[PDB]
Design a protein around this ligand. Structure first.
Ligand SMILES: CCCCCCSC[C@H](NC(=O)CC[C@H]([NH3+])C(=O)O)C(=O)NCC(=O)O
Ligand SMILES: CCCCCCSC[C@H](NC(=O)CC[C@H]([NH3+])C(=O)O)C(=O)NCC(=O)O
Lengths: 222, 222
């Protein structure tokens, strides 16, 4: 509710988008406190002294940091709402694994596109994203088993872990002039991304690619 | 059994030690298959094709990769045994956060001492480990609340997440000549470490410092 739950956030952040989507799924009302480029709110400094990063969930004045730890907490606390993590332990392990792979391997390689110097090191980095996308496409096929989401009939953990990145992937496409996810290259993921973005829990916190692209260059600021 | 549970590991690995300790806590018997430097077993290649890393837990021919995911899996599957994660959602979010801290910041920072070239960029790195350790000492105090472990009366998630590194910490002290965890700089951690290494789930899978230091030598395949 607006009282007991605050989210420290910033609308362009994929990591923060993970928390908002998960709160929506649970039908948890909350207060959204937005950070600004170039400064830190006193409440952030207080709540996340170790990392000073967003998102931070503040529940009855108790802070929870790190997006995936926050998703887990919302799922373990509001455990009577719709399940975010899969029911079965083995399936939970698979889902955690692929979320960890996205933060460790995939998203860093996405950013390494806007970071490569030379038209060789760029194309090499493009090949790495495409390849990891093929892994992700196959994973979705094996996990979803004909159902709309990674988590089956309903958006789950992995949906949220990967889906949060859709805005920045679409931005990365336009600026690199490379399409990564579409009907032709990744037919299952393309169908999945349509469902995910139109889901009610997602629809209103997933930013238009147009806005996000412009903030992307507002972040042209060394 | 020694049949139904296989662990692909290697005795010098602190990440493998995580899985071994958790299995012992649950009293789960398992087969231990050891990797060797410069090779990958066929069974590892088919079980962790994405990362080709150990540990890998194979449960009834089903592979689970990544040490903290493995620990979660063991705690969630053998859910009638002694609990590894805390019971409370908030405490569990805090125990996850510090384990995540250790793998993101502390441990690479520990390794960045050995890899530091130039007497003083080394000093910078040495100060980073001591800063990090003061944080963990204070965290141990606030979290144990006078109990012997991070986990209370019994060893817990965070005990395992951190203590798995004790052997390599010692090696790092030996080689760098610096004293990091001890009665003067980290009094509580110093007593805890002795308690931890004494635990039955721990004492047989934690390698002797000198043995480990010699393997660190053999780790001269450049
Ligand atoms: C900036 C928006 C777009 C760039 C992508 C990063 S999103 C926001 C970013 N958040 C983080 O890096 C925290 C990640 C954290 N490991 C988590 O998963 O929760 C941030 O600004 N954290 C504060 C900081 O980096 O200091
Ligand atoms: C060797 C002891 C020094 C400690 C660092 C490396 S331990 C062994 C190393 N394991 C990992 O990197 C596991 C990382 C994984 N995140 C996990 O937590 O399990 C490995 O796979 N080794 C084989 C490989 O990476 O190819």
């Amino acid at each position: 509710a607006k009282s007991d739950v605050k989210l420290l956030g910033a609308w362009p952040s994929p990591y923060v988008m993970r928390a908002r989507i998960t709160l929506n799924v649970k039908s948890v009302d909350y207060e959204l406190l937005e950070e600004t480029l170039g400064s830190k709110s006193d409440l952030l400094l207080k709540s996340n002294p170790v990392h000073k990063k967003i998102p931070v969930l503040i529940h009855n004045d108790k802070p929870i940091c790190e997006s995936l730890i926050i998703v887990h907490y919302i799922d373990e606390f509001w455990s009577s709402g719709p399940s975010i993590l899969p029911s079965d332990p083995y399936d939970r392990a698979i889902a955690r694994f692929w979320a960890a792979y996205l933060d460790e391997k995939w998203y860093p390689s996405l950013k390494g596109i806007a970071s490569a110097q030379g038209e060789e090191a760029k194309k090499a980095a493009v090949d790495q994203v495409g390849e990891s996308l093929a892994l992700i496409e196959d994973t979705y096929v094996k996990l979803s088993k004909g159902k709309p989401f990674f988590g089956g009939e309903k958006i789950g953990y992995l949906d949220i872990a990967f889906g949060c990145f859709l805005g920045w992937l679409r931005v990365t496409e336009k600026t690199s002039g490379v399409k990564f996810l579409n009907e032709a290259k990744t037919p299952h993921l393309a169908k999945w991304a349509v469902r995910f973005c139109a889901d009610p829990a997602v629809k209103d916190v997933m930013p238009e690619t147009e806005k996000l692209a412009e903030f992307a260059k507002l972040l042209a600021k060394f």
